[model samples]
Target chain A: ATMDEIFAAYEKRQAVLEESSNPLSKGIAWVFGELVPLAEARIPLMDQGFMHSDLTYDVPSVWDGRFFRLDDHIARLEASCAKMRLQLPLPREEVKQILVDMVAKSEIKDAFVELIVTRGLKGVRGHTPGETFKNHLYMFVQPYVWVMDPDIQKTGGKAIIARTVRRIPPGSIDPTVKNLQWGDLTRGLFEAADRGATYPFLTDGDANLTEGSGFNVLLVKDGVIYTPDRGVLQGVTRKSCIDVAKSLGIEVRVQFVPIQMAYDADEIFMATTAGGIMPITTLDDKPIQSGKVGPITKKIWDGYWAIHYDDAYSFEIQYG
Target chain B: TMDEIFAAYEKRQAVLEESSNPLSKGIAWVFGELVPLAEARIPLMDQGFMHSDLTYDVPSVWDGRFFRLDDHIARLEASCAKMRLQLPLPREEVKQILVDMVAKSEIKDAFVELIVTRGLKGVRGHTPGETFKNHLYMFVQPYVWVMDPDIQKTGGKAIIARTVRRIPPGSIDPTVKNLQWGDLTRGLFEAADRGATYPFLTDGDANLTEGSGFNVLLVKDGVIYTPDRGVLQGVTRKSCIDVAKSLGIEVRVQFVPIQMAYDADEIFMATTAGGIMPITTLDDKPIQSGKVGPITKKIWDGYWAIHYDDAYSFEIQY
Candidate 1:
């Protein structure tokens, strides 16, 4: 097609997509202060969040119409903003209500909710309070996501330890702040696909396991659980897995898990909000012990989901 | 204000800005349509926003002409290829779109930004390679300066960042002009805290790298030196070498240690936003005479003159 024709077609397609009511059936988005169909939610192209990845976000999942660790997620998002020198556009309660309201509007019993704070437009570039640009807040709710398919999780999934890319050193980018600088992660994803694996676990400059794109790595060794102590997002789901493991009388250690340790693990699994306690039965195309989901994995997976429904951890969404 | 009230206020402001004062801000070509810059938006789901899966180039216009326009386009195409992103339009067509926007804006001196983003795809588990297609976005606004021209009169100050290191070339290729600015922004914050104009980062081995948005060069013993690797292969840096060679000054591209910069005869940053910007202070310590050196002044004059040279500048149709 001609250049103008391509533009015309794209414009027409965007209008149809924006105007259609079908998007509401799939998901809803709270952009700034307005709720719209997920497809219609957009930010200015010049937003530093889009232009420079100058933003932080957190994903809190909902199960059975209740938010799992909603307060914990909010606190983490606030901490991330603070570390990144971004002010939350709204107060803590307001941010929480926005998330609750958006999920309520979507009415998805199991939902993947995302909250983001960006550095706003590329205004005068200074970090002083007076010169600092306004920060933008965006939220969206969609049907729940799983790092691995449930069917695959039954038998466990496959992952490769990426050699092509290492996690950006924590010194360069603090992994604690949930920012979108995913160049290394995405490159590792491509490497995983090329190796015929479902996911890739990246190592740090020291050649120790750090994390996957959206999950944290955990390995079971001699009945003890271990996760990397640094170069990770300090995931809310990861903390839940640790708590659940300890409750089950399992010893959990937070320290650097060497690359060889994963290869030598009795059982390995990834922890993520989207998919809790997902076992990786195979490493780099080779089977782990028994080449099936380990007994420990099964126990924690069950316990993790059960706690999601607990009154202490879950906040019931007031769907009006 | 309450959350709902603030949101409503923001929504109203957005509408008024997009509808009533559209062109007053600037003009943009989003996807395919020409719209007010204020109204040009990319979907939240675009991998460019979600994952920084995009590449861009900014070429500036001065006196109704674009300096190194062809070179910038060539570099951008290379960047797209490296990132596995495809421009939605042919190179010539893309060039026309840029020219068209600037012509329509009637801004003789403008900063033109063009981006190619990895378009949206499935709900989940779609890799970068699985994007539906790549989309292009462009905008034209008043020219921006990395180091303000006013500050360029005497010189600018900078610090060699001690806290943040450049994201190594292995993870995120620095040659590709992508949006991975986490390291740069962190360094900028350090610079701000320390009263420096910009912060030049170092590689893992302690070799000097580029600054936030410009390339760094050091003059020593009447010879010029720039980092041989871990930099953006800047178009302006290339021009500086050309001008320096024609003027009989030696130019060396090698691994420049941080110490060399502190002891250099002169230092200047090269960028499209601001041509040749001299640096007189490093970490608050003066470099030699602590003034814009004679060689830097000569290069500064030569750099601006090239903007008018027929061989380098493309006259905008407008």
Candidate 2:
């Protein structure tokens, strides 16, 4: 058979598989100019993203059929790609359109959208920094994810200061760029599970709090909010929480937050795109100031969702 | 179409692709089935692809026989245990799969790669949970050399990476064979721009660690030293130590300072891809003789001899 006939037959078979076998049919993925069910999205084993973790990505979520702070997410993604020297396959506006279209196609009311750029394939193997290879853009839309379950978030969750693993040094991996180097994070998760906690917050070489797997650490002390300024992802929701807190006349400080300070804080919380302003009331199984969601955390949480519907930050998707 | 018909067609298409491609000279064992190397693929959402949650080892076949196949498999198993990843198949089954792939490829001398990935998570999260199973992928292709044969004869040029540092051992255990190569890739760019063949990264304390795919060693005053920390505990590195001991050369596994390496009498690297490669130049400055040293030559010759020794080599059925 000709190449065209073979591809046609493959597509027919793929459609059949998608309809009958795929469990993730509700999710949509865009790859190499084609949109397919999430279950059918496959990349070559040789793609540097799979082999070498040579990629960067960004996640922005949708709430009530509108995207929250997508422009910020795109800008961060661009910065991350630049830091990693990975080029996006399409123009910025075209990438935005693709993301919007994916969410619309998936019909997920509250969607978690991920955009990725990988060093596409192995090129001439003799050095030159992987620049000789092309870059690939992959995007997917699925139901919204929460770093902490909603029920746990409602009553506030418990966490442990990771004893097994430390954050990767900033010199080796720039934490500001969203990449797939999750070796430390995964180890910390296992440590948390063994310790019987809801999450784990890893420390740096000096024992200063860095972050959780997918979120930023925040401590509420003396009517002020403090977060670590180093060894973190510079999260968009983190910035949002600070802005919301400042707008309410609460002072926010970004600085080195030692684990001791977290234990001593009046309240503690986490900021992330997966779930905004999640409260943590227990640390290492010890309660923090009555062990319930504090008034400031509740206020910031309410303010965070309020901005999701605000005309200034939210982009409404046109679903047809 | 019915599910059974679709499944049969899928299998038939795989066969067609495998047979039609001229470049698919190698064979791959992905999960449970065998296919052409060009046709092997993993799902996009697999944690191994999404998060680099995988471990792998590469053992080469020389003269149609595997060199230290058992050692390589043991190290792979150790890596999985360190990363909390369970192998999909038993150790014996995995060994058979590796040999079978090389036999099917018909490559007399080949580089074989075996990988175990933390399989797909049923839900979206970074927590590796009980719901996830592990996956295995193996492939055999033409042998790859860490340093080209021509370059090895003349000696390779290396640079001590200035812009990037090796990931600290506290963050990720270096002994585990993992896919975290972001820093190594950056260091390669530094090497390319600086006109060097490879880059050797240092740790946070200004001590020399390993290079992209090999471990670094230095000889001073007839004594050999390699970094005790922040390295993969390579099988070839172990062989180098054993050979040095047999040659009555004093070997020290300790923190090798960067300056100490710069002042050494000779420098060499060891890896599974390339047995023992001499690096005659560092940061544009040549070593004492600016050629493959006498010690490196002896170790290199000894390393290759073991590949043919029946005690260490495993003969392939092919």
Candidate 3:
């Protein structure tokens, strides 16, 4: 399809999705070319854009929201705007206030919200900057039921370290912006999916352990959590685990982990906004701590939920 | 009457500098719409010849006086050479054709757009050499009427900054003045986003840059100042500069920093169509005096009359 066709189709679909967003949850999703509430759109879709931030997570259950770290997600959006040279029109506080308000005003529940900032429909001929060279704030909430695999939740999740590579250090397009304009991730996703890895662990160009397509990884080395510290992004859930572990008297380091070093750790884990506190009990085919979730993993997962349900602020503060 | 022209002008304003969304701006959108109209009239196949990824401007060459005809042909053909494309007519031939057209056509003020691009790589993600498409389009646009009171006193507005930054020389020569000016449109949108009617292009260090669609300026101590050729080597810019110099005004061709502009007495933008419109504000803030001072008025007054009479074809009695 033509760019105009694809853009128009997505916009129509977004409108439908927004109209159907439940009343209990905040209305959010990429609509037209920008973010919109479940019922209405204030920001036009034409004003949206980001450069290459999608990491192959399409399941609304796993994504569309439901990431363990919401704050980190917002920060990631801002970071993308900065790299793209696109100014985010709203203040950070305003962004947060609006998202929370939209969620609270609606009747949605147990859903994940997808937020995106990418170069939206712009340009005259639909060329770069065709309409208005710009970026957008998009949010979509997905009703997910990850507990279908309660055993995985009980024992933690598993990920494979595919022979994929993250963005290189000297590249022009940064990896962390979660932008929409880039094609690198889209290509890599195709390559990795072909290689039969459910969750591909990407490396730097030189084969250093970067993060996964969507989640961050950690390995317990002598009881301390060791993870690859690719500077592009620090998944909110990854940071949350460290904080939770710190309270539980566990040490975590934000440093590089050679592939071998990461694979050989006593325990393995992955974290992302969609699936929080995921335990990786296997590397390739090797069993991670008897192929089960560890005590530390369960503890961190509980702590994350504790922090989530604990928030009691009224979502109406933004409208006021 | 020139709605499409205004539209083309407007699109170029939007898509130039946008990052991830590198598509569509003024002339681009105009071509996006009008080329289809032309296509509907002509129905040329998508055989990679009659279309463009980005569209540049062109004016019909009237034969009345052939003002700088050789140079016009030279620049248009030079643009071809720079992009590795060949022109259908030789420089001398195109000039002769222009001289003859000016002598015959009804166009009063003619502007020709030479569009040279390598094929439709299709979308912004096309690989190199995906399509080698090139064409030359020329037409006449309405003459400038810069004498209006509102255009005079309320000097035009501009956003002054170095943040969006100009592309370095190698990436894209501000000269050759090609069609794929995504930066220009992006800059304009940013200006509108900031609510500024016009925006100045600044170098990395905040040096006074060109305006989004034309050459830029600032005046100090009763003398005129504009950016050197680190920006566009505008034929119109050169024409107006020569006019200012001939008027015995000290036209300083040098680098202008944002500081100097912010502190200067007047600012203005010069284009082929707008001629010289006073810039009343920078970065949305009113200038030092918030009025179209003497220097801008002087340039516009001289520039408008010169283009009207000398652009050949004004009365078309060759």
Instruction: Estimate the lDDT of model 3.
Output: 0.50
Q: Is candidate 1 or candidate 3 better by lDDT?
A: 1
* Residue-level error in angstroms, candidate 2, position A164: 1.3
State which docking tier applies to candidate 3.
Answer: incorrect
Each candidate's chain A: what TM-score?
A: 0.91, 0.90, 0.69
* lDDT tens per residue, model 3, A175-210: 454522212232344344455334556566555677
Clashing pairs in 2: none
Top TM-score hit: 1
Candidate 1 local lDDT, B1-318, one digit each (tens): 123322543454454355443453579987678998877888988878888888899888876788888899999999988876787888999888888887777666678888888777522376544545887888987666676655787899899999999988777888999788888998888888888868899987879999898899999999999998888999989999988987898789999998898889999999888778899999999988888998898788777778779999989885
Q: What's the distance in Å from true for residue A116, model 2?
A: 1.5
Ranking of predictions according to TM-score: 1, 2, 3
Worst 10 residues of 1 chain B by lDDT: B1-10
lDDT of 2 by residue, B1-318 (tens): 123322543454355355544433677787688887777788888888878888999988876779998899999999988887777888898888887777776666677888888887722354544545888888887667777665777798999999999998889989998888877888887888798878899987889999888899898898999999998899998889877887898779899899988899889999988778899999998988799898888888778777778878978885
The whole-model lDDT of each prediction reads 0.82, 0.82, 0.50
A56-80 in candidate 2: lDDT tens per residue? Answer: 9999998767899999999999999
The local lDDT score (0 to 100) that residue B317 gets in candidate 2 is 82
